[PDB]
């Protein structure tokens, strides 16, 4: 898979080939992360917190 850096702990994050931009991945540091596209790169940033209007 692809190896991306955690924007929180700088650890290594193994992101599956399954992953699409916008998917959530959990890292061992305790951070929830979102994958996004930066030009030709997949990258990770801090995921949003659950909003009071979130769900179905």
């Amino acid at each position: 898979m692809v190896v991306l850096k955690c924007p929180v702990c700088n650890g290594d994050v193994n992101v599956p080939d399954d992953a699409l931009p916008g998917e959530i991945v959990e890292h061992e540091c305790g951070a929830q992360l979102e994958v996004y596209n930066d030009h030709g790169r997949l990258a990770l940033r801090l995921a949003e917190q659950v909003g009071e209007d979130w769900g179905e």
Partner: protein, 281 residues
């Protein structure tokens, strides 16, 4: 036909919808509305149909409204999102048409909420009109519990969370019923079984899916409910009352369906794309 899939967080449901669009050879783009702004102009009119999938109800509502302004047909429409997204508005529509709903009283202040508890007696359910996944759905069994819940709601940052739906508690089977309709036709139903240490059936809270038999009374209740609110792709939550039978609890405008698939073996994303192809090509 060109389809746009509107997303913020991409869950398994969004991935399966994108896969179904691909496999059925539908041209589609994905716009992430947590990342891209949307102009009020005719540019988005290049799309024939938008499938509205943000997890944020306000994002679903507003992205739908912008796309509609460009003449894109949205699933669901902003009118449906607004109604199904709000339990008081949903109850108002359903009650007017004689669809059974839980016996409900609306309280729009702390003072009014305590009066509603006093009128109704215990036990009762108190939930706000906005929310999903069981969030802030509270079981109120005595006045101490009611008083502390009232105080907690008063400190919420969204004033819609301060509106109280105070309802009879309907549960004697250990489950609720979840159905999905596409095109105002019933796709299927299944049971969400309440897990230990819970009062709520939501799959998000540990609710376990199982299949059920769908009798004519259940089908007709659902179909009528969906027809009243005009949802194109919606879920419906049904409670079972020991005297009254099926009671409609809520409808949802951006339905999740992981649990529905494990129970029914229905390929929901495939069924949705087939519907869109047949109706909007």
């Amino acid at each position: 036909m060109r389809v746009v899939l509107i997303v913020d967080i991409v869950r398994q449901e969004e991935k399966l919808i994108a896969k179904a669009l691909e496999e059925n050879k539908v041209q589609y783009d994905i716009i992430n509305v947590a990342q891209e702004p949307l102009p009020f102009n005719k540019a988005l009119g290049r799309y024939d149909v938008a499938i509205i999938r943000p997890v944020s109800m306000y994002r679903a509502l507003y992205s739908s409204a912008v796309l509609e302004a460009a003449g894109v047909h949205t699933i669901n429409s902003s009118d449906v999102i607004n109604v199904c997204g709000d339990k008081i508005l949903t109850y108002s529509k359903l009650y007017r048409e004689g669809i059974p709903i839980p016996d409900s009283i609306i309280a729009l202040s702390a003072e009014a909420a305590l009066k509603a508890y006093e009128q109704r007696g215990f036990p009762l359910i108190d939930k706000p009109p906005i929310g999903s996944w069981g969030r802030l759905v509270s079981l109120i069994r005595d006045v101490f519990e009611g008083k502390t819940i009232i105080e907690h709601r008063e400190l919420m940052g969204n004033s819609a969370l301060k509106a109280h739906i105070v309802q009879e508690y309907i549960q004697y089977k250990g489950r609720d019923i979840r159905c999905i309709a596409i095109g105002e036709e019933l796709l299927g139903c299944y049971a969400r079984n309440i897990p230990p240490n819970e009062w709520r059936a939501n799959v998000a809270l540990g609710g376990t899916p199982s299949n059920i038999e769908v009798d004519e009374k259940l089908k007709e209740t659902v179909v009528k409910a969906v027809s009243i609110v005009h949802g194109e792709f919606v879920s419906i939550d049904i409670l079972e009352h020991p005297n009254k039978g099926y009671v409609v609890n809520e409808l949802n405008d951006v339905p999740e369906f992981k649990g529905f698939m494990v129970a029914t073996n229905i390929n929901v994303a495939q069924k949705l794309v087939e519907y869109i192809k047949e109706n909007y090509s």
